């Protein structure tokens, strides 16, 4: 048992008790992913309308 | 209607238990992977305790205590006894954990027996050697060999005692009143032949009825006094030690488990714990009675529709 780093103030206090010692995607990349998904939606929609036109 | 699942087709005990559950009309066996069950008869290895107790409105019970392996693995049992203040221990043979680690602590206690009975047994393929040479060359545990076992007469033969212990969801400890002695029908040779280390009794196994009679005739004592007090003590000691680690008192799911305790008796009528089996079988004559007791004490207590001695604590 050992209590260390005791900080005290009028609002309370803090400390540490030790019992044992031991033994990203850029903006452009994100835009590409969003537009690729939009493109796939637009492709699926265009196929549908082509199906409905037939 | 209660529901249960079977996830170890290879179990003799719980194949009979599920048979009894179905023979009551109030239990329905589901598919292997149906999560909407009341009772799981789980697999021996890799049981997914983390998925139990999360089905809304379902009280779920499993036939295994998570963490009980520390008692039922030879290596981890040696460590549990040595590192646990509750056990520290007079009923467990001197043992050491050595990987192919207490390699050095063993040799220290060994030679001080050679210079001054110094037979040991290595197991986890077993080897009983009088010298440490072939023992160390052979995770394994090295254990002192009981060179003075109680021998049954006639036959001058060795034996061990199997005690079945059921622990329910309330962590009550029940000892099946019927045990089994598993005898070796070969005279105990004292001077590598591993056969004495149905001629007299059927199936090479002797029940308490007969063993108690022998103890009275041959030794003027009873099974209860000379042996059963020690077995009950050892069982309680072992299971109370791990209770904080495995209890499911305030857990989102509940466990019970049937244990197989293996004891040995020396010629001074002292009982030694050999090992604890986490998935034990039963004696053919005792399957019906024990399996019914499991349903009565462990299952029906949680899901309502004595052959056990209750070890108090």
């Amino acid at each position: 048992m050992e209590v260390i780093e005791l900080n005290k103030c009028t609002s309370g206090q803090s400390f540490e008790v030790i019992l044992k010692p031991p033994s990203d995607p850029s903006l452009e990349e994100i835009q590409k992913k969003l537009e690729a998904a939009e493109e796939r939606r637009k492709y699926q929609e265009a196929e549908l309308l082509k199906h409905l036109a037939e | 209607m209660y529901t249960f699942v079977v996830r170890d087709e290879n179990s003799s005990v719980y194949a009979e238990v599920s048979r009894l559950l179905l023979a009551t009309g109030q239990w329905k066996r589901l598919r292997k992977d149906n999560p909407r069950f009341n009772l799981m008869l789980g697999e021996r290895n890799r049981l997914p305790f983390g998925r139990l107790g999360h089905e809304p409105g379902l009280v779920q019970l499993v036939n295994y205590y998570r963490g009980a392996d520390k008692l039922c693995r030879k290596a981890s049992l040696v460590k549990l006894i040595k590192t646990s203040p509750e056990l520290s221990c007079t009923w467990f043979p001197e043992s050491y954990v050595i990987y192919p680690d207490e390699r050095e602590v063993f040799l220290a206690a060994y030679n001080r027996r050679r210079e001054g009975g110094n037979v040991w047994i290595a197991k986890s393929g077993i080897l009983i050697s009088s010298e440490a040479s072939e023992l160390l060359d052979f995770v394994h545990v090295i254990q002192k060999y009981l060179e003075k076992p109680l021998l049954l007469e006639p036959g001058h033969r060795k034996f061990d005692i199997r005690s079945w212990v059921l622990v329910d969801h309330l962590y009550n400890i029940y000892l099946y009143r019927e045990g089994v002695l598993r005898t070796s029908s070969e005279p105990y040779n004292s001077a590598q032949d591993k056969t004495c280390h149905g001629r007299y009794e059927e199936g090479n196994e002797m029940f308490f009825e007969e063993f108690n009679q022998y103890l009275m005739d041959a030794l003027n004592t009873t099974l209860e006094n000379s042996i059963l007090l020690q077995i009950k003590h050892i069982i309680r000691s072992c299971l109370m030690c791990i209770e904080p680690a495995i209890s499911t008192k305030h857990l989102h799911y509940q466990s019970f488990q049937l244990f197989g305790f293996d004891f040995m008796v020396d010629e001074e009528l002292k009982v030694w714990l050999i090992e604890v089996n986490g998935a034990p079988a039963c004696a053919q004559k005792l399957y019906a009675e024990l399996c019914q007791g499991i349903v009565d004490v462990a299952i029906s207590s949680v899901f309502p529709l004595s052959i056990f001695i209750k070890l108090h604590h």
Binding site: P22, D24, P25 | -
Partner: protein
């Protein structure tokens, strides 16, 4: 003084955010109209509470918060509730039709069209900060917005605020109170995409909150209001160190330093005690030892799991009320002997303790009784991997048949993202296994 910006995404995040800011105002003495008689720093000042509240010349204390939801009805509660005066329209961002419990819809279809606006609103708050330290992001795993849009926002926040810490408060899905069957999908999808962008995430399993409300508060069928008042107490005790004078967890970086040695293993388990029904006139005031011991009962955890069968990497004890270090140490020494607390070998077996003397504030007319001392334990234990295993299993059951997948592909997501996300989760489960198993 370093400011903190809170972001609330989707119904769960918004309704929990509204509950938290109500509790903050009560804790800091801020009236519904934004006025704060305690603040002699009229129109300014850099006190501890200013990390969460800016100040206008008229003396109004405005939360540093942004609310985002792709449906108007939930955010209209904010602009019409008790604390409506607290916020101005620029803080509230609403769409017209929601993500329909569809990650793909929240992330790609709708997220692409609203991300810039949300960022514009956040930038407006950031421009107001002298030293922004990061963001606190509230959201659900199961909702199409909470999962889908949040992960997109987190990606962009890493781009636009590279140096800033990001913490999450995430609602783990529970069938007891959820209506969607696809929530396991949304949970894995958003966890995979958000993993490298979050520094510390506090998961709250609705199942745990629900059961704590039934058992300890005697509410037979808890509501979102019941759940959120309790959740906001947990959040409050976690964020108190940012809002009051102190020396533990005083900025967002200290959360990762104290709780996350392995960056991917950044999901601390929260445990809170005591939770006492306000209907019970007199309840025996629990001691420091009793409430500290309660931090090791699975029944008081924000995620139901068994820490006895895992290993600890870090432990933090956060007390509010009449607590002194002497009693904490006496309690710790007691529990260490009677509990299974195995730390990993490469971490110290210790506890970081913080005490704030103000006892927990309760909402007048709530279900929670005022107690004289309470504690929240934040422990990074491998046991919380049980939550990942459960979720991943439900994923596997549906994905093996490709059930509901067409809804996601229909919004432009590739089936490959499912397996990619699932593989990332399997690796996460392997990391917990590698850390917590002998």
């Amino acid at each position: 003084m370093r400011e903190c910006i809170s972001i609330h995404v989707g119904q769960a995040g918004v309704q929990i955010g509204n509950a938290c800011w109500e509790l903050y105002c009560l804790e800091h003495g801020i009236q519904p109209d934004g006025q704060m008689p305690s603040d002699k720093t009229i129109g300014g000042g850099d006190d501890s509470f200013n990390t969460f509240f800016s100040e206008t010349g008229a003396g109004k204390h405005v939360p540093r918060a942004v609310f985002v939801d792709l449906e108007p009805t939930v955010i209209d509660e904010v602009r019409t509730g008790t604390y409506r005066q607290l916020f101005h329209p620029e803080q509230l961002i609403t769409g017209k039709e929601d993500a329909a419990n569809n990650y793909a819809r929240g992330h790609y279809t709708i997220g692409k069209e609203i991300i810039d606006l949300v960022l514009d609103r956040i930038r407006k708050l950031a421009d107001q900060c002298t030293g922004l330290q990061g963001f606190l992001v509230f959201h659900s795993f199961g909702g199409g917005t909470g999962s889908g849009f949040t992960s997109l926002l987190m990606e962009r926040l890493s781009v636009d605020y590279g140096k800033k810490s990001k913490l999450e408060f995430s609602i783990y899905p529970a069938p007891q109170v959820s209506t969607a069957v696809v929530e396991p999908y949304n949970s894995i999808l958003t966890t995979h995409t958000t993993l490298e962008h979050s520094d510390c995430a506090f998961m709250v399993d609705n199942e745990a909150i629900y059961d704590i409300c039934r058992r300890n508060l005697d509410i037979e069928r808890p509501t979102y209001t019941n759940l959120n008042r309790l959740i906001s107490q947990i959040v409050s005790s976690i964020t108190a160190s940012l809002r009051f004078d102190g020396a533990l967890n005083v900025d967002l970086t200290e959360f990762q330093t104290n709780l996350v040695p392995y960056p991917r293993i950044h999901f601390p388990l929260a445990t809170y005690a005591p939770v006492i029904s306000a209907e019970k006139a007199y309840h025996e005031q629990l001691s420091v030892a009793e409430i500290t011991n309660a931090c090791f009962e699975p029944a008081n955890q924000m995620v139901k799991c068994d820490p006895r069968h895992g290993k600890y990497m870090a432990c933090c004890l956060l007390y509010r009320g009449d607590v002194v270090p002497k009693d904490v140490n006496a309690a710790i020494a007691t529990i260490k002997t009677k509990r299974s607390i195995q730390f990993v070998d490469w971490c110290p077996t210790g506890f970081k303790v913080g005490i704030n003397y103000q006892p927990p504030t309760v909402v007048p007319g709530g279900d929670l009784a005022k107690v004289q001392r309470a504690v929240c334990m934040l422990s990074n234990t491998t046991a919380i991997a049980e939550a990942w295993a459960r979720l991943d299993h439900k994923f596997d059951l549906m994905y093996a048949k490709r059930a509901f997948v067409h809804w996601y592909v229909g919004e432009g997501m590739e089936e490959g993202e499912f397996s990619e996300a699932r593989e990332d989760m399997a690796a996460l489960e392997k990391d917990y296994e590698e850390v917590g198993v002998d």
